[PDB]
Structure formats: C-alpha cells, structure tokens
Amino acid sequence: SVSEIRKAQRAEGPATILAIGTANPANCVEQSTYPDFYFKITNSEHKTELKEKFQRMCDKSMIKRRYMYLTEEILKENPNVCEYMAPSLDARQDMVVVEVPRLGKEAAVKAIKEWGQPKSKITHLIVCTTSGVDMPGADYQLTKLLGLRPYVKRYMMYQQGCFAGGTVLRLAKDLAENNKGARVLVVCSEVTAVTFRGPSDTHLDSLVGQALFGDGAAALIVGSDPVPEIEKPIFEMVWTAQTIAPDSEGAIDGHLREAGLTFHLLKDVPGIVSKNITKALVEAFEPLGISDYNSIFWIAHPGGPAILDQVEQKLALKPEKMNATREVLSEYGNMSSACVLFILDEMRKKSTQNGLKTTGEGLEWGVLFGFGPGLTIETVVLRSVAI
C-alpha cells in the first residue's frame, strides 16, 4: 500500500532551473573611492599604514562596485557598527531581519514573473542567508510578503556562509525530484549590515571582508518534469557533492556575537581550494567520462579574485572560462551564498544574447562550485539547455 503511494508521489526527471531573478539594494558603492569613504566613515583617517593596505586590497579585489543597504546616513546613526568591535547586534538584526526578506522578495517576484505560472503552484520554499536570524524566520516572512500558500513547505537555512548557493541547489534537487509536481522557490539573500565594522591593524583578515562583501539576492524556480512550452528549462542538475578539505581546520570562521558577525581567515583559502578542486572535479566528472575541464562551462563562488586566479592556474583553464564569474565579482563583489546564482543568470543571459547554442556558453556540461567555512566545497554538476 505504501509502495503504490511512493511510486505515485515521486517526480520522474532531473531537477531543472526554470527561472532566475536577482535584486540588490539601490545604493551603489564605487570601489575606486571606497578606501577614502570607509576610513572617513569609521573615523580611521589617522590609521595611515592600514589605509594604504586597504587601498591595495580594494585595488586588487577586481571589484568595480558593490550594492549596500548600509549608507552614510545609516552608519552615522550607528557608530557602534562603525567601530571594529562594539555591541551592535541588536541594531544590525533590526536592519537585516527586514532587509533580507525585502530584497529576497524583489528577486523572487522577478523569477516568478519569468516562470509565468501561478505562485500558488509553489510547493516548497528554501530561504538562505548568512545575515541575521529570527523566529519565525525569513522563510515565514517571504511566505507572507509574496502571498505564497500557507502550506508551502519551508526550509530555513540560516548562518550558512559562502558555499550555500551550492547547498540550496543540492537541497532543491532532492525536493523537486522526490515529489511529483513540486516547484521550489529558492531564495538566497545576503546583506552585509551584520558584518560591516571598522578597521583594526591586528585584524587584517577582518579588513579583507570589508573590501570584498556586497549585498544582493537571487531567486530560482526549480522543478522536475517541466511542462513543455509552458515552462522553460535553463539548466538541469545532475549530481551534487559536499566535502571538507583536509588540512583546512579553521580556514574561514564567522561568529555571531554581541558585536555582530565577525569574519576570520586563518589559512590560505585560494591555496586550499586550488589543491582540492581537482579531486572534486574527478569525483563529479570521471563517471561522465569527462576530463577536459575547458570543455565544460564554469560557475565558481568568487570568494576573492585569488581563488579564481589560482584555480585557473592549477587547472590551466582558458582565461575565458571564468568570464561570467569575474563579471559578477566586478559588478557586485562577494555576495556570499547568492553569488553563484547571479553567475548562472549572467551566463544564461550572455549565451542567449550572443546567439550561442546552449545556455552554458554553447557547451553541454558544466560545474558550479561554492566555497566557504569548513573549509567546505559544494559541487553541483549541471547540464545546459539548447538555445
């Protein structure tokens, strides 16, 4: 009796991305003048050697601009947030408990418009953030804001970190594939108001975060068995993995304290990622008979430019493989979990714009990586869609 229920309950094909929408806070922060702005707003103009260090960090970040909820006015009303270490979580929480779901909503509405189907067909909702926590969570808030059905099945992924654009895909794949008819709204929404803080010359790792992290949200619609010519596949998920790199204990740690979310880097992240990326690739692609890593399309969490450069150098990727990734890093900076989803959007839009044969730059198979605390590597194997 259960066998019949099970066979009738499950979906049949591969989880597919059917729509992608993004959004960012309206405030555009140029990187070229950021060092001058940041050192003034944090009352750190006298830390001249540190300021020079920050300028080099920003000049080498390969980020031209970021979008930030935080403004000069907001920072002027919250001096505790402008300090390196002052009690400020309640202020930060008040910002991000509202801004996460607000920005998420903006991205989600865009994806839902693109998908074109009734929002009442959304059966599952995954919400992911590294920016603040609350109960009921941002999943409840987004259900209310969007007018989803009350019986949507929710998955609130809090305090996840930069690899979770990969984690939400891994999770959505099982939801979509094991449930016939299921349509999963996937929302990653990240707001750096929880992490912004002043500079300290004995905490340079912390300072790196201030050059790289930016805000944004991305939303997907994921489902199996798309309805031919009503729904429009963009990418298909085939296989996923998550692993912890050896010798990386404590590489990237973030603690949520009374002073907000702190960021620490205790190990060479570019070097750990580059030494371990090959093994992740062979686990994913050896069973598909593929070993030429220029023959697949690429999406890599741009944690900083050095991760990308060292990965490219390790594997001998052509410089063009990382173009969509670098274009997102350039235009938005490191938006933690949302970044990889912006990169998927950029890639399928550019491929479609330029008349390529597939959404994956004209290539069939592709890989998406997320990198973050653990040190964790998330791998998602994708297949593109014709046109």
Ligand X SMILES: O=C1C[C@@H](c2ccc(O)cc2)Oc2cc(O)cc(O)c21
DSSP character string of 61-116:
S---EEE-S--HHHHHT-HHHHSSS-S-HHHHHHHHHHHHHHHHHHHHHHHHHHH-
Q: Which residues contact residue 204 at a Cβ distance below 8 angstroms, ignoring those fewer than 6 apart?
A: 53
162 tagged catalytic:
yes
197 annotated ligand binder: no
Regarding 220 and contact with its own copies (CB under 8 A), the answer is no
Q: How far is the CB of 275 from ligand X (least distance, A)?
A: 19
Hey, what amino acid is at 36? D
Q: Which residue is nearest to ligand X (CB)?
A: 254
Among positions 106, 177, 215, 346, the unique one binding ligand X when judged by CB under 6 A: 215
The binder of 191, among ligand X, its own copies, none, by C-beta within 5 to 8 A per type, is: ligand X
Which of 239, 229, 236 is closest to 348 using CA atoms?
236
For its own copies, the binding residues in 265-294 under the rule CB under 8 A are 283
Q: What is the CA radius of gyration of the chain?
A: 21
In this structure, what token pair is assigned to residue 382? 């994708």
Regarding 174 and contact with its own copies (CB under 8 A), the answer is yes
Q: For its own copies, how many residues bind (rule: CB under 8 A)?
A: 73
- Per-residue binding string, ligand X, 305-344, x by CB under 6 A, is ------------------------------xx--------
Q: How far is the CB of 246 from its own copies (least distance, A)?
A: 7
306 annotated ligand binder: yes
- Per-residue binding string, its own copies, 346-385, x by CB under 8 A, is --------------------------xxx-x------x--
Contact 386, 322 (CB under 8 A): no
Which of 279, 253, 254 is closest to 375 using CA atoms?
253
In this structure, what token pair is assigned to residue 75? 């920072």
For ligand X, the binding residues in 231-290 under the rule CB under 6 A are 252, 254, 261, 263
Residue 135 or 386 having the CB closest to ligand X? 135
Residue 171 or 186 having the CB closest to its own copies? 171
Question: Residue 198 and residue 180: Cα distance in Å, rounded?
Answer: 50
DSSP character string of 206-249:
HHHHHHHB--EEEEEEEESS--TTTS---EEEEEEEEEE-TT-T
Which of 256, 195, 186, 182 is closest to 218 using CA atoms?
186
For ligand X, the binding residues in 124-143 under the rule CB under 6 A are 130-131, 135
Which of 251, 381, 247 is closest to 303 using CA atoms?
251
58 annotated ligand binder: yes
Question: Residue 379 and residue 199: Cα distance in Å, rounded?
Answer: 34
Regarding 134 and contact with its own copies (CB under 8 A), the answer is yes
The binder of 140, among ligand X, its own copies, none, by C-beta within 5 to 8 A per type, is: its own copies
Of 128, 162, 188, 339, catalytic: 162
In this structure, what token pair is assigned to residue 154? 């929710």
56 annotated ligand binder: yes
The binder of 133, among its own copies, ligand X, none, by C-beta within 5 to 8 A per type, is: its own copies
The binder of 257, among its own copies, ligand X, none, by C-beta within 5 to 8 A per type, is: its own copies
Regarding 370 and contact with ligand X (CB under 6 A), the answer is no
214 annotated ligand binder: yes
Question: Residue 285 and residue 88: Cα distance in Å, rounded?
Answer: 46
In this structure, what token pair is assigned to residue 31? 């990187």
- Which residues of the shown chain bind ligand X in the complex (CB under 6 A)? 130-131, 135, 161-162, 190-192, 195, 209, 213-215, 252, 254, 261, 263, 335-336, 372-373
- Active-site positions read 162
Binding residues for CoA: 53-60, 306
